Structure formats: structure tokens, C-alpha cells
């Protein structure tokens, strides 16, 4: 099964918990999630160590971008070096111009979204 | 050969203080040619990302502030550790914030280190880095 990496920020996770589970639940039916079992209220060499085997492993990473976060800003920058392909998923705040601009289409791609569609848009990206 | 240095912080830090950002660059500039000095960050983004990249590449030293979240700014240190730059990231715990465990367990003292620092000493703190 393909394997799924999927990462937000604490603040994203804390107002929205449910979000953050929703996309776990609809990636669920499209491979592994690898990091599904990620508690966000988390020594952080263990942890920087296990996130990139995660990121390593992973076939697609999926980004929950529309809270500024440093560690998820540095998954993306190490999945892009490792040459993995990346959907970032954005709330439309004005997203960071290093992730709007990291996009090419294809393999980093950026999308805007409401909450309501996530699903949807989940759907659409896994069966193209 | 001047050592080219790499500078970058978050667009609330950059709110925030303005002067703190403006200290860094500055002291920076007696160590070497900072890359990221005339950066604005008031900013199609595809021209943006192509030039920060090749700024993170020209780069002997990377230096970040990180004592606000940032995607731009973890982005530009995941980038940075994949070129193999040597990164120093400067965090003010004073601010109330814990750092992010993706940055703090990036740190291996030497390569890739985490400083804790208060306003007021970044300038000795960059002196002793750099070796003044
Ligand atoms: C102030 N910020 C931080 C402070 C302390 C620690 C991290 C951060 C930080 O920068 N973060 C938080 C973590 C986030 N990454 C992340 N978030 C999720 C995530 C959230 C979430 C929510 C619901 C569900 C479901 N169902 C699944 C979820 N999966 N996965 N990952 C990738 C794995 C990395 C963790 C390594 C694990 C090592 C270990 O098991 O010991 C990036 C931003
Ligand atoms: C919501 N956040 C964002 C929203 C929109 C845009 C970016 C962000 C974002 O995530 N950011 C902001 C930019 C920041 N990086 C950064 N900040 C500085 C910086 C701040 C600063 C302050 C004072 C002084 C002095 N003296 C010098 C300074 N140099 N350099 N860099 C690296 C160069 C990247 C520029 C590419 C140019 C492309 C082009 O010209 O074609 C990371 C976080
Ligand atoms: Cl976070």
C-alpha cells in the first residue's frame, strides 16, 4: 500500500482536532498514514529522528499549511530534498510566499480550501 | 574570499521588533556579505522561492530566527540542512514559547545549533559564533 505522511501545525490541531482527523480518516483510504498516531502535545532527537524516517518512507506527504509552523515548514523543506511528492492544503491569512512559491503543479502542489470540502478534494487528488 | 551569510526570520518577528532584525543583519555584516540584508518581506511567488533558494545555496552560514513560528523560516532550515550548510538558529525564551521539537532535535551542537539567547546580548553572542 502506498505510504501517506501527513503533518499540521499545534495551533491547527488545537482549534482544529477534528480537521486534522478528518484528512487522517479520508488518507486512510488511500495507503498508510504513517504519522496517524502522532499526539501533537509531545527527547526531540528522538523525535526529529523518527519524523524523518516517517518522511523517508513516505510516498506522498500532506500538509496542513494554514497556521505558520516551524516544524512543518521543515518536513516540507526535507520532503522537497527528498524528492517526495507534496500537497499542501491551505485555508484561505496570506500563506508564507516559500510555500506558494515551492509549488510547480505536479509534484508540490497547493491548494486552497474550506473546511466542508476537504473530502472532496482528497477524493480528487488520489484518484488522478 | 568574504564568507557569504545567510539571514532570515519570521514576518511576525520582523513586526514585532523590526530593530532586533535590523541588530542581527547588522553585526553580521562585519563577518561577512549577508545575502538576505535588503530583503523587505512585505511580498510571482515562484521568482521568490527560485532566489531564496539560490541564496540558501551561495551560503557558507545560515542563521535563523526562530522565536516565532514561521513555514517560510522552517522551510528555509529544512532546505539549508538538505544543502548541508552549517545553520545556527537563534531562539529567545523569554518570549514565553517553546521551541519546536523539529528544530531542537535538529541540533547536533556543532553543524546545526540552537542558541537561547535575551535581546540584549545577540550582538556578543554573534561575536563569539563568528570569533571576534
Ligand atoms: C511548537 N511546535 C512543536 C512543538 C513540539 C513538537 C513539535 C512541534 C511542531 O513543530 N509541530 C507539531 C508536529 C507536526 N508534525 C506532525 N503532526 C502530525 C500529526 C498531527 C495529527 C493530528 C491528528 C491525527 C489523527 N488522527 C494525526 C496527526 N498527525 N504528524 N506530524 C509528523 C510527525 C512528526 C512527529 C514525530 C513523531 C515522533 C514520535 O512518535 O515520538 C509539525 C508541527
Ligand atoms: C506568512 N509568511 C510569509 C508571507 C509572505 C512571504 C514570506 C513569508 C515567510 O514565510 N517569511 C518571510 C521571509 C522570511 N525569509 C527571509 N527573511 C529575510 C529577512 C528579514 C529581514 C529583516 C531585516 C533585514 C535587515 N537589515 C534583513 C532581513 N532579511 N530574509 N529571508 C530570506 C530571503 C527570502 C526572500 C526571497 C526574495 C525573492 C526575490 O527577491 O525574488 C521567511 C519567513
Ligand atoms: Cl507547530
Same mark, same amino acid.
Given at each position: ?39 501533537? +502535545? ?15 518512507? +513516505?510516498?506522498?506527504?500532506? +500538509? ?16 522537497? +530534498?527528498?524528492?517526495? %511528492? ?6 484561505? %491569512? ?35
Amino acid at each position: 500500500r502506498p505510504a501517506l505522511y501527513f503533518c499540521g501545525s499545534i495551533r491547527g490541531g488545537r482549534e482544529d482536532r477534528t480537521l486534522y482527523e478528518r484528512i487522517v480518516s479520508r488518507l486512510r483510504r488511500f495507503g498508510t498514514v504513517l504519522t496517524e498516531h502522532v499526539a501533537a +502535545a509531545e527527547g526531540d532527537r528522538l523525535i526529529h529522528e523518527q519524523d524523518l524516517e516517517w518522511l523517508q518512507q +513516505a510516498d506522498v506527504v500532506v +500538509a496542513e499549511v494554514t497556521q505558520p509552523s516551524l516544524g512543518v515548514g521543515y518536513e516540507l523543506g526535507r520532503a522537497v +530534498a527528498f524528492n517526495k %511528492r507534496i500537497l499542501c492544503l491551505f485555508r484561505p %491569512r496570506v500563506l508564507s510566499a516559500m510555500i506558494r512559491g515551492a509549488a510547480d503543479g505536479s509534484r508540490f502542489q497547493v491548494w486552497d480550501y474550506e473546511e466542508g470540502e476537504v473530502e472532496a478534494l482528497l477524493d480528487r487528488y488520489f484518484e488522478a
